[PDB]
């Protein structure tokens, strides 16, 4: 006793692509933990001084920080062509939107020279059009880096993702959690404080990137996130 | 690193009176030392800050935001006096020398008009 | 100076299979942390009201919870054939037994409609026959999901496993550990409590499953484990 | 707008090798956490009783412990040839040195029968010659196990590495961190202590090694590290 | 044959599992009794290898089933409309209405006190009643 | 959310007597306030629960098991009275109104026949 | 048109970002004003779609830029040597020198007290000043 | 597991005197029990170790290293006496029997010449 | 040539490593001395490049070896049956029996007290004794 359903035409188009990525790009992973208390405080401060114009989220902050870190270390903002390496100077980020019909890949352009409001508005307009199924092809064709977030589900601590064919890196974000940290109380002792953290995983190709480059990339991202004011410069 | 000292006289008659009297009505006898330490504890509670104090990252971040828009002008400490009477002396660098003085006078006041206060 | 030993006939039969799985199934991982204090209390409560009939273990609880989660999300209880997808309605679980001669793959059937006692008795009868080397071939041929446990060794915090050829998922269980958690004391403060946790890793194929489906699967498993009474319905 | 740079001659020599390793060696990972407070105390005790002869580091301790663990479990100190398995009796370890021109692979020989001073002196002489670009070919050709460390960067908690072609295992070391642990205070209660830990990842091939063997290997390494005096025998 | 069952613990279990839901379901005493009947029948087979219960609609496969599935069947088939009969809806196998009785409790001080237990009266046979009864007073055994 | 108040008179003569007497035999002088707070601390120890109390998951689970087969009928609290004498008043919702009363009478008893108790 | 701006918060922000560096850069009030000018210049376009500022060297693309890049340009071009003019270097768009003024503060005790604020005087137009002013008193809005 | 007992007489007159006197000058009245427990607390502070004590791994490690070159000869405990007077008795195994004695005499000394000490 | 060695620390190290085992092995003073002899020989080679010790059975490769391997060899070869001789078994290179001597300790109070140390008496040469002696009093140096 069982049932069989014919394979969809669109399911092979992604199956072949996924099968090509693994056999074409060696993978190596890097993990880190980020404290995001200050970022939450800043978001709360900036989401109450408004009258209804906008509303922000963590993903926009991560996107902007990802742009800055890309700028500081440009070797990740590259691509592997037939017989030559391609190096860019503009950062385009690919965001993943899930729908019952499948997974789409909206794009955001000019992140380096942009603010949070425009990024949010673009990400939401594109998410709406992706859900409503009137997306032009040029709008989801190519980027430099890809991001995935699963913070809506508290049961996902950390996970991995596959790199897209022409790209050389991808980032995966988990859900927040709480951990104990040591605090030097002014009385001259050590006490327990409760910090909130997220675990970030990055997958890199080893033909265009090396371990040290990825480690430096993670360091710049961390420095930009833990200190949020540095998002200005 | 230049250093400087501050000094102040003292009279311990009232503490003697309280100790003697307590010994005659209950039986409890305790040394002057506990009076000295207990006075030192109540003193290091509200002492001004050096004029050349530099803040830290968290403090500036919180101000810039708006959580602690009212700043602070007090901070605890951990001092230990030097023995003597007819005097109490302390040795500290120049920057805090002034703060160390607020400590001497605070103890100099409590120990002369409020000895009873340091009882249970 | 060195030594050489001829390769065994049975060593190539598994080498070829392992080499075929990696090049045929793209892999992506998901991780989670489970609290198992209540489960231990329940096991202690149910292992003392008996007179010698049975004795339970954590693996049986995980197997049953794995069956329930499979039932709620059926897309993982599937398989990829030549040109059509296969969807089942009965949950069969593959358990791994290690012996000096190699690694076997006993099977348990009808887990959805079963109790802990029967599962334990089957797993132990099959483990004995696997150790004694009188196992029929039909008894280790096919399932839907595979499980691996390494809680007997305290030095294994987390690890990965390879998916079997016809299957589309595998679960790996680690050893328990202790962590600090925040407790809201009735006096109106926050204190430190010591919880015991395990880290569970799940490996999924990306042709039959997507990220959201795996995340939901992990959520159902977690919900069933942390609240153990829900094993009844 | 973009730029293109011709691919280097040395870049393909490593690209082809990396691409051959993934398609030739199935990979499975194992992770563990090690407490290194006692090791730091011992290092401090042994780096102050000297007059300038030497100066030690954590990597030497890990190398020696890795040799002992290899000796106890010899199945990892092996190799896969055309049609026969190769089993050694001497432990040679490959250390990774990063330079702007690329990544090198110095070698240390006779680790089993050696002390910390000689290991440090060899690792530093070879690191200097690798940086100065006068390394003979025989000096970086073959070993049994490979090690990678990234403790100089605090932003790297855990990461993965690729196995070399003729070898069957590799170890990756992260950066230290601080965690809370329970202590049974003599008064008859439970308190919080702050331990310092590192997270160690090991990648193994599944044609020469099995899960149980790797788990035992990790156990021997852990036992040797947490108790440092056992480095003598 | 007649017996008395104490069902205080079972009510507490029902309240625990009816509060961790968001509106999905709601259980009752009849569902628990149906599942226990299969187990009691299973141990003493003299009263086939499949257990079918008549509430006269029919429910199948109680042995390999959970409370969720059993509850849905009992209510769907009711709307369209071994044997069990229940009359617990009127406070004034056959199942009666609950009541309260006094029982002795061994106080830690070393004397005997009064506590209020809740009971219901239910009407080879002795062994069947014993196995059924064991499952009710101790409810956790419904899993295995 | 309906709310209701509860009130009870008070006499503070005995506390005055204890304070005066203590001042004459040792020297210690303390305010009525500490008597008020210390009475409030000893009071919020054993207070009944509302009849419409709903338990939590852990409580029911532990009962369903058999670890805490004996249930509880007491629970601490955090009340703060309102000043006044010849009266002590409290404002609370209807559900707890009854529990808030056990508090008033408990303090009303301790402060009238056991003032000495609130001394060291 | 004239207005008064309070710049106490802005100084604190500058001190925060000039201490987390190791020698890489150092910011000043002029850089902040240039970025804010682009903001209010965009909100009210009547005063093109690209914003160019003359300090007479030129700075380009202030809208899509950060403080780091703007600072480096303003100093490199100075060495080789809309419009802005500053005269804050002498304590005795046009920008003046800072000064201190008394303002009322609502003390929590329920009265009015004196606090010392730092101010500078800066010389469709009203809307432009308002948008610029909003960015200065509230500095966090420089991000969006 | 052989077991043995140790015993020592006691006189409680001084505690009675302190209680009576305290009751006449302030009003405080407290039971003998708190004197017993407070004496037990001050006693279990400095008690020798059994001659057949075996160390643990951490202790031997630090020794070998050089952090605690100076070893320890004291260790706290948790004893509870048995009631009685004209006697205090304790039951313990043979190994610690000697340590349990240091406890009896320490309390036997404190409770006879320093009753006042156990007051605030 | 004669010298005196203090072996209190070495005994503590032996007790530490003989308690973390489950029955696998058990060490003794002779094994430690053999390993130290190689090191002392290594620093002063005038007393070959391989070190062989005769206990007259033979032990090989002490330099590239640990206590576990050395102990097993010394006991296996004994059953079948530079040079070392030991007579520590009777309390009444050549090694004698242990004894206790008084030494001065600088008490923190600022005076001199008596402490009880354990000693043994062992019978270019001076340098050899010094290097051997350094390894014994400070035992941690047996690793490098």
Residue numbers in the entry:
A (entry chain G), C (entry chain A), D (entry chain B): 226 to 458
B (entry chain M), F (entry chain J), H (entry chain F): 264 to 349, 392 to 425
E (entry chain L), G (entry chain H), I (entry chain K): 255 to 301, 313 to 320, 330 to 355, 370 to 380, 396 to 426, 438 to 458
Any passages from the paper?
To determine the interactions of the fungal E3BP:E2 subcomplex, their CBD and CTD respectively were recombinantly co-expressed and examined by cryo-EM. Tetrahedral symmetry was used for the preliminary reconstruction, and 3-fold symmetric sub-complexes were computationally isolated by symmetry expansion and signal subtraction. The final reconstruction to 3.2 Å utilized less than one CBD-trimer per well-aligned PDC core particle, and permits the CBD from N.crassa E3BP to be built de novo. The CBD of N.crassa has a trimeric interface with a symmetry axis that coincides with that of a core E2 CTD-trimer. The CBD trimer interface has evolved from the dimeric interface that core CTD trimers form to extend to larger assemblies. Additionally, K266 from both participating CTD monomers interact with M2 residues N325 and Q326 from the CBD.
The 2-oxoacid dehydrogenase complexes are a class of protein complexes with acyl-transferase activity in metabolism and amino acid synthesis. They co-localize 3 catalytic components (E1-3) that act in sequence upon a substrate-carrying lipoyl domain(LD) that is flexibly linked to E2. Like mammals, fungi also utilize E3BP to recruit E321,23–25.
